[PDB]
Amino acid sequence: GSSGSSGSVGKPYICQSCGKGFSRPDHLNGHIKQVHTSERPHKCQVWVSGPSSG
């Protein structure tokens, strides 16, 4: 029951976001920065802000 365990013969650079595929590094990048591009929240400019953590 494998029916898998294979890739694509041509475009090795496969997007690690959706699964797309490209031939060049820059080409794929644009897609990840043109389609996947988005904004995400970050820490308060520090590892721990509260009383303690770890």
Q: In the bound complex, what is the minimum distance in angstroms from residue 32's beta carbon to Zn ion?
A: 6
Report 7-46 residues binding Zn ion (CB under 5 A): 15, 17-18, 20
DSSP state of 45: S
User: Total residues at the site for Zn ion (CB under 5 A)?
Assistant: 4
Q: In the bound complex, what is the minimum distance in angstroms from residue 5's beta carbon to Zn ion?
A: 22
Q: How many CA atoms lie within 13 A of 53 on its CB side?
A: 6
Residue sitting closest to Zn ion (CB): 15
Q: Which amino acid is located at 17 in the chain?
A: S
Beta strands in the chain (DSSP E): 13-14, 21-22
The residues that touch Zn ion, with contacts defined as CB under 5 A, are 15, 17-18, 20
